[PDB]
Design a protein around this nucleic acid. Structure first.
Ligand SMILES: Nc1nc2c(ncn2[C@@H]2O[C@H](COP(=O)(O)OP(=O)(O)NP(=O)(O)O)[C@@H](O)[C@H]2O)c(=O)[nH]1
Ligand SMILES: [Mg+2]
Lengths: 94, 419, 75, 136
RNA sequence: GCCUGGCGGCCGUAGCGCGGUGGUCCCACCUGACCCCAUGCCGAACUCAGAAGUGAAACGCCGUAGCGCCGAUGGUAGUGUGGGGUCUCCCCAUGCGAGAGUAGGGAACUGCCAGGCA
RNA sequence: GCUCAACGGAUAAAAGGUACUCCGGGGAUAACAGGCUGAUACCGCCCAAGAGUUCAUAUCGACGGCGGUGUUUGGCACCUCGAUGUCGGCUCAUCACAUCCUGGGGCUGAAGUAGGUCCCAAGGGUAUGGCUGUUCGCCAUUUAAAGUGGUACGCGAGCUGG
RNA sequence: CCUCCUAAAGAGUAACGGAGGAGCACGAAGGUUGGCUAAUCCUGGUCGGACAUCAGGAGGUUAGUGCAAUGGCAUAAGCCA
RNA sequence: GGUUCUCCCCGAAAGCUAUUUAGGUAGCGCCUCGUGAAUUCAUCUCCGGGGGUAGAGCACUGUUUCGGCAAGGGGGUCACUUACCAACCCGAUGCAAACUGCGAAUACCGGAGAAUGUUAUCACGGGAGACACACGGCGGGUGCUAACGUCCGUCGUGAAGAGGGAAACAACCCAGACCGCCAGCUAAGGUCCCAAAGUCAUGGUUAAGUGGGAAACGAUGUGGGAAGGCCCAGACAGCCAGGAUGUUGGCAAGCAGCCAUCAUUUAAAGAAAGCGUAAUAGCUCACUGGUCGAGUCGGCCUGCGCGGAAGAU
């Protein structure tokens, strides 16, 4: 049911990630299987309200990147130490 | 809560002797672990150590052998005697008054109790300013030369006196607060009874049983600090205030008694004192003497008193009863705490104790006496209730004269039975 | 009670990987054999490692225990 | 009042309290009190907050204390000069960084948990926030 | 080509466990002990003269992710230089960028010599 | 042949008092007062277990928390050692307000008189003696009140010298 | 005088900073040749107890080092002749 | 303490070691003049190295919390057992300057290569001065992550450095004065007047003179963002109506306290929210509907504001 819409990261690193989080996106990674890992950026408020639901961390999610639907599972979440925010999500293909 | 060598001396010649068992009780209540209890006998105190040179060397040897941390005398000893004992044995020395002040310091949980205990400690320490060891040495000078202008001993005396005055001033503030709390009741025609006596007299548990209100009680000496007041029912005058109080011990420090002036205001102005006495204590006469001595010290011995002998259950084959003076006024009562024996007789004696009316009226009216129900049941009660022929209702009532007068003013008073 | 210390011993690697050494030059001063000796390197009585031949210093890790060895490669 | 039973040494250096907290998730119970600020938490403060919240929940549920004060803090007495050796140990503190979950709580409704944690946070010297258990 | 022995390279992706398998040669145990040699007692070990037996144990090989081991990408922490703040601590630009953890890998690879069987 | 151990070791061989004091220096360095700080002190607030005849917040307020002043004790050694006279008293004062009295007001466990507490308010007022060198303090007797602090702990080129 | 830390990953680095030691010992406790491998626990066993020696097992240095601490030590630098 | 004419070039240190030494002095470090010897030296790139710091982690050394599987002791039976306690091990969770199965950035050592630099490197000789340092930044010990405090490391400035800025203000920011000019461009910092330059352009916020001093904490101030409940089955605050049966539940009536805390007819009612009553009666909250026709309710994240906020000419 969960359909996230994400872009492919032009630049990756500390500075780029913090610029994303100041612009209210945040980075994430898709790995697993045998295709190469894909580094993407997501919309923070949308994914936060999405992961408020408990079944987010159990169902098969879909992510739309460059018009391609990739089916994934949420593997790890990195959260801000004291704010209700997200730093990074790891998605495993399945 | 450290290791101590305990010291007691049998001053049998004069009344300056103290009880070793009570002393050990105070020490254990303080929490100190006793490694040895030394005894001596003397005629009058030795000025240099408070004990002989031989006994001082024995206490030094005992400290050296046992590795003790403190030495607890059961007696008041001067700062010079403390200094000389300290010089002989490196361990610290605690007076009986110091032990009592330490016990109260540990026990104090309220703001008032902390204030009083720190005032007592400040006065006790102001007594012990004999050594002015400081690193600034004597300030030399002459006429027209710079300097502090005064000695360090005088400066320290100034500072101690100033801070003592500060603690005192906050204490009269606390007295004003408690006096407002008192004055809430005095404008009312309040009866107030304060139960007081030697420690471990069972008076706190007597309060708990009478008032059905939980207050701390145990086998710990000086268990209670600060008073607690509770409403109680008495047959004659109705509502009365029972007050628990901090207990006494033989030879309370005078600085402590002065510090507790704010707390003792309840006993000062009590309409009755219930002097609760442990009958099972073999030193019962000494307890009477000590309690009367402190009452005289605070100048509260002219108040009406009534003795209450608790712990009759420890007396074999005894039943409670009330001993009465030649004027037919109950001056002594006996009772028990846990078994509850003697409690109703204590209530009856309390009814008899304070009152100024014995007349009983009988009232009756046509159907206009629901207001009479309300007013009677409002002031006190209906003493004897019944009806009679033709719908008439014949009450019998006995309430105080002030209640009579206020009821007469409020009502039309066409009953022509109540004044 | 705690105003004491010993003169510092100036221990450590005195001559680093790849530098040229004459015979007899101390490579590393050490308490215990933190570096062991390999080719053309001698161990002293206080565990000093010195060059036994003119060459260039080389560091390596050898053996089952992954121990560090000092060797001198003849230039 | 918490304290280590024993220690290798009696006096630690002052150090610094930089960085972000580890152990930033509610692990044992369902609810937790998390530190938003930074600073020390003394054993007296920890005891005060624990007593307040345990009174707020009248002997019900279960309470975990995640922070333990294991750092000795020395203070020199008054009328003493500088130097002449390091001061004597007077109390123990727990260094708190942002994100550190301090207390944890289970077996209670969320309203009672919030009330108890307000009463506790009224005793601590650092800003805190309410947190709830999360999956992954 | 297959198997064994000796000596190396590398030093856990190489180990420890579990299951199976091998005696032609080799190896192992094994047979005996005046002597060569030895037990702070013991032919257990060291050692000598051998070859009836069995691969039981050991050893080698093969299979198994039980444990060990290895281990990205992305993010995070930290930090050099320059600048800023609300300056006990942080943030911005730029360069370097962990540890832990996840996905996954992993039942080593190889050189000289000798013997047996093809 | 060295506890030359004060361990780069004055000599083989060596302790104290000075208020009867002296001389060269140093504000490189203490005491006074000033400065920085503000642990301590004083005041203020946050939470509310509890006390308060029932009743957390009339009046208080434990366990703990946060500030303010610069005011006590301290910390530092910044100024002054080619001199910045110290405590108390007398004379003369001046500001602050965290108000002692008098004014205005909210609450009150304010029936009335009399109070308590908080808020506004600095115009004016704001003891005399015994004891002691005293400041303080105790006491006697007063008053509407006998405020708390700053001013080199105001004030010796104004007095005194306990 | 020696060990560690402060000490900021070469050296070095102060305070009346935090903690401990030395002012020796040994003709074997030195040299060399040959040989060997610990602590602890589990189980069974005469006197035997939680802990004396023996037998096997797990374990792999949690032992040892003449004396503090640090760093080392299985080729052993540990033990025996 | 004082030490007398001029100009030109270079130009410190306030550290280590030792000392009856500590405000003295000596060697070295630093200055300077001279002589001599090589890419000698610095910077950057690449290459070869060793770290054990920051961070991290918890195998080790210690410390810590909870749970699990459970020896062993002890209050009692006079070997059972256990509301106390409970080591080992297992799982999760943290902490360490004197912990490390990990581990940077920098710095340091060495080699090679350009370019650049008044040889800036090394040695020797003549002459010194100096060995009270101060503050600022970063990393620390100590102190209270107190001090214009003290003690180290490292860089900068002052010392020994003028000019511009910070009102004034050695050590902070910009910036290194050979001399003259009534010429121009910029740095920090500024551009309404004192006072040189925008009463400049565009879009927002604030109403507090906030700006131009301050905290926990308190608050329908005001702007913005993402969701949520409800509403044309009519919502929210407004406007009418009912709160009773056992029962005065029991140990005082719902309303001192304590225990049951469940039904009920029913549109609905907690054995009752405070007031109040001696206490009932009473008061009416929770509790439910009618009428009323466009939005309403309250949590989260954030910009800027408010109170908390009292000193002496
Ligand atoms: N045997 C017996 N023990 C009694 C009796 N009354 C009281 N006690 C016990 O004596 C002790 C009394 O303590 P407490 O009630 O605090 O009396 P208290 O005098 O008010 N204590 P304090 O004055 O020191 O604060 C308790 O141990 C109580 O058990 C009695 O009648 N008989
Ligand atoms: Mg009592």
């Amino acid at each position: 049911m969960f359909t996230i819409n994400a872009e492919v990261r032009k630049e990756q690193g500390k500075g780029a990630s913090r610029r994303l989080r100041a612009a209210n996106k945040f980075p994430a990674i898709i790995y697993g299987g045998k295709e190469a890992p894909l580094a993407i950026e997501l919309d923070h408020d949308k994914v936060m309200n999405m992961q408020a639901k408990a079944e987010f961390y159990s169902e098969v999610l879909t992510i739309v990147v460059d018009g391609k639907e990739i089916k994934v599972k949420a593997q790890d979440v990195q959260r801000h130490p004291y704010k209700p925010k997200l730093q990074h999500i790891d998605f495993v293909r399945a | 809560g450290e290791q101590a060598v305990l010291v007691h001396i049998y001053f049998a010649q004069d009344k300056d002797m103290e009880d070793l068992q009570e002393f050990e009780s105070l020490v254990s209540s303080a929490g100190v672990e006793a490694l040895q209890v030394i005894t001596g006998s003397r005629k009058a105190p030795h000025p240099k150590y408070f004990v002989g040179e031989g006994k001082a060397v024995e206490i030094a040897e005992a400290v050296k052998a046992t590795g003790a941390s403190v030495v607890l005398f059961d007696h008041a000893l001067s700062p010079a005697q403390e200094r000389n004992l300290e010089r002989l044995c490196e361990c610290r020395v605690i007076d009986r008054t110091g032990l009592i002040l330490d016990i109260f310091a540990q026990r104090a949980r309220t703001h008032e109790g902390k204030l009083q205990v720190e005032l007592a400690q400040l006065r006790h320490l102001a007594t012990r300013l004999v050594r002015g060891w400081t690193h600034l040495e004597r300030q030399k000078g002459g006429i027209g030369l710079r300097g502090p202008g005064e000695t360090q001993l005088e400066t320290d005396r100034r500072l101690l006196r100033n801070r003592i005055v500060q603690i005192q001033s906050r204490l009269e503030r606390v007295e004003k607060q408690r006096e407002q709390g008192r004055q809430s009741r005095i404008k009312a025609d309040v009866p107030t009874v304060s139960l007081v006596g030697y420690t471990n007299a069972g008076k706190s548990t007597l309060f708990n049983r009478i008032t059905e209100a939980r207050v701390y009680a145990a086998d710990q000496l000086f268990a209670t600090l600060d008073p607690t007041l509770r409403r109680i029912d008495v047959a004659d005058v109705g509502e009365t205030v029972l007050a628990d109080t901090v207990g006494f011990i033989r030879h309370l420090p005078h600085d402590l008694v002065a510090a507790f002036k704010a707390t003792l205001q309840e006993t000062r102005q009590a309409t009755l004192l219930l002097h609760v006495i442990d009958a099972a204590d073999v030193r019962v006469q000494e307890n009477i003497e000590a309690v009367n001595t402190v009452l005289e010290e605070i100048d509260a011995h002219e108040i009406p008193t009534l003795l209450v002998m608790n712990k009759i259950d420890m007396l074999e084959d005894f039943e409670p009863r009330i001993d009465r003076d030649e004027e037919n006024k109950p001056n002594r009562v006996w009772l028990s705490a846990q078994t509850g024996a003697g409690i109703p007789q204590l209530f009856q004696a309390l009814t008899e104790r304070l009152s100024g009316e014995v007349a009983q009226h009988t009232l009756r009216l046509p159907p206009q006496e629901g207001r009479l129900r309300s007013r009677f049941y409002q002031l006190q009660a209906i003493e004897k209730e019944w009806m009679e022929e033709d719908g008439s209702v014949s009450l019998q009532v006995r309430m105080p004269i002030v209640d009579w007068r206020r009821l007469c003013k409020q009502e039309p008073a066409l009953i022509d039975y109540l004044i | 009670r705690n105003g004491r210390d010993s003169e510092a011993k100036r221990l450590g690697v005195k001559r680093f990987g790849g530098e040229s050494v004459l015979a007899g030059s101390i490579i590393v001063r050490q308490r215990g054999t933190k570096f062991h000796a390999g080719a053309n390197v001698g161990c002293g009585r206080d565990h000093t490692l010195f060059a036994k031949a003119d060459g260039k210093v080389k560091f390596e890790v050898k053996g089952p225990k992954n121990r560090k060895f000092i060797s001198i490669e003849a230039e | 009042m918490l304290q280590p039973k024993r220690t290798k040494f009696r006096k630690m250096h002052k150090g610094r309290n930089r960085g972000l907290a580890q152990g930033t998730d509610v692990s044992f119970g369902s609810f937790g009190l998390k530190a938003v600020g930074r600073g020390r938490l003394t054993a007296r403060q920890i005891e005060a907050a624990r007593r307040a919240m345990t009174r707020a929940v009248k002997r019900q549920g279960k309470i975990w204390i995640r922070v333990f004060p294991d750092k000795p803090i020395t203070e020199k007495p008054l009328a003493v000069r500088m130097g002449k050796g390091k001061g004597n140990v007077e109390y123990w503190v727990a260094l708190i960084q942002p994100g550190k979950v301090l207390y944890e709580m289970d077996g209670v409704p969320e309203e009672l948990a919030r009330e108890a944690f307000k009463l506790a946070a009224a005793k601590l010297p650092i800003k805190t926030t309410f947190v709830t258990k999360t999956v992954m």
